Design a protein around this ligand. Structure first.
Ligand SMILES: C[N+](C)(C)[C@@H](Cc1cnc[nH]1)C(=O)O
Ligand SMILES: OC[C@H]1O[C@@H](S)[C@H](O)[C@@H](O)[C@@H]1O
Ligand SMILES: [Fe+3]
Length: 392
């Protein structure tokens, strides 16, 4: 097995306090550069955007990032216990008396986020600054041989902020907001083998959905060396794919039937409205579109096990351009237990499909071969594509 990600991903998960500190500062730099992109387009208007289930107001997102960090660091009286932390212990107050009523994604109703008396952009940035100052002061108290338990929440809040930064990028793309921030095709042989799937104990930070690590049998297959390109995808559209329900699942057909334009999201070929690059990774495809292309090509999506095995064993397996739909429903591994942020994984089993890899907007500190992403299979706003495989 190769390393699961770039140095930053390994350091945030396994490295000492100095490593988590650098990660928190990089995450905040990125949060604020994206906040400036939104500021340029919306001028700090709140809510600044119309309502959609796939959005949150930009100033709500910023406050949520600070709230989350403050909730799990400064206000957390059991930081040292890591995953043994009692999530519902009595906490110190927030810097903002109403923060818990505004920013708690577990408490605040979705449409309500457009109608809160939130602080302005300046005061929201002030809350971010003061909370980060508090977090770094507490981090600086930990010794260089600090245990995984001691670092657990520092690592969690850095990863959480990386995830909200990516969400800013895909929501920006949805809102037509501009931000400042493939090779030759090939097929790879994946031989029959046993995969030790998920995150092993004492490998540093794991998301709860990566556990338990467990051996699984991988069947021999041939897998795309990279994500499906527009060049490889569009011949399905040109061959009448979005007119031929027979290529689709029942859920796919139901979805397809309800679509005005019988072609991919952000296309007209022109994307966004610039002309389309065939060498680009097909993106803003949902699981239904990926699966239909696979039936038409006589290919299939990998399981997340097959994807993880390929990513860790095959040097020519190139990922990180688009999130990649797998055939795997988001379900607990054997021995799954929810970690202190209980609602991260457990409410979303069944209704979500696993995507693996990462996209151009994923932080280098998050992108990881063991990471399970999870969205409802109709979602196209996300930076999602896919790679295909077949039996030998
Ligand atoms: C891991 N995904 C991307 C599915 C999560 C990330 C997340 C942010 N705050 C809580 N969870 C999501 O978007 O709900
Ligand atoms: O805004 C991104 C992300 O934020 C988290 S906090 C929300 O709960 C989730 O529904 C959404 O996908
Ligand atoms: Fe969140």
């Amino acid at each position: 097995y190769s390393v699961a990600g770039a140095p930053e991903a390994l350091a945030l998960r396994a490295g000492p306090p100095a490593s988590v500190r650098a990660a928190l500062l990089a995450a905040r730099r990125r949060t604020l550069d994206l906040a400036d992109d939104f500021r340029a387009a919306l001028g700090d208007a709140y809510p600044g955007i119309g309502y959609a289930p796939e959005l949150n107001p930009p100033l709500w997102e910023l406050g949520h990032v600070a709230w989350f960090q403050e909730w799990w660091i400064g206000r957390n009286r059991q930081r040292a216990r890591g995953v043994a932390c009692e999530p519902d212990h009595a906490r110190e107050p927030s810097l903002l008396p109403q923060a818990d009523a505004w920013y708690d994604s577990g408490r605040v109703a979705h449409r309500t986020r457009w109608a809160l008396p939130l602080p302005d952009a300046e005061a929201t940035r002030d809350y971010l600054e003061r909370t980060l100052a508090q977090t770094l002061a507490l981090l600086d108290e930990l010794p260089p041989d600090a245990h995984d338990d001691a670092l657990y929440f520092f690592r969690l809040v850095a990863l959480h902020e990386a995830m909200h930064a990516e969400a800013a990028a895909y929501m920006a793309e949805g809102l037509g907001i501009a931000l400042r921030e493939l090779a030759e095709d090939a097929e790879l042989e994946l031989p029959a083998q046993r995969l030790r799937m998920g995150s092993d104990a004492g490998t540093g930070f794991a998301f709860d959905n990566e556990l338990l690590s467990h051996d699984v049998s991988i069947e021999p297959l041939r897998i795309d060396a990279q994500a499906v390109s527009w060049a490889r995808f569009l011949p399905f559209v040109e061959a009448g794919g979005y007119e031929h329900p027979a290529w689709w699942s029942d859920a796919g057909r139901d979805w397809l039937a309800r679509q005005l334009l019988r072609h991919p999201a952000h296309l007209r070929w022109q994307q966004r409205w610039l002309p389309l690059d065939p060498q680009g990774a097909a993106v803003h495809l949902n699981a239904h579109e990926a699966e239909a292309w696979c039936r038409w090509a006589g290919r299939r999506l990998p399981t997340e096990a097959e994807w993880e095995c390929a990513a860790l064993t095959l040097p020519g397996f190139a990922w990180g351009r688009v999130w990649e739909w797998t055939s795997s429903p988001f379900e607990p591994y054997p021995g799954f237990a929810p970690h202190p942020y209980r609602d991260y994984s457990a409410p979303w089993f069944g209704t979500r499909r696993v995507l693996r890899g990462a996209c151009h907007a994923t932080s280098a500190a998050l992108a990881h071969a063991r990471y399970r992403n999870f969205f409802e299979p109709h979602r196209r706003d996300i930076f999602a594509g896919f790679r295909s495989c077949r039996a030998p």
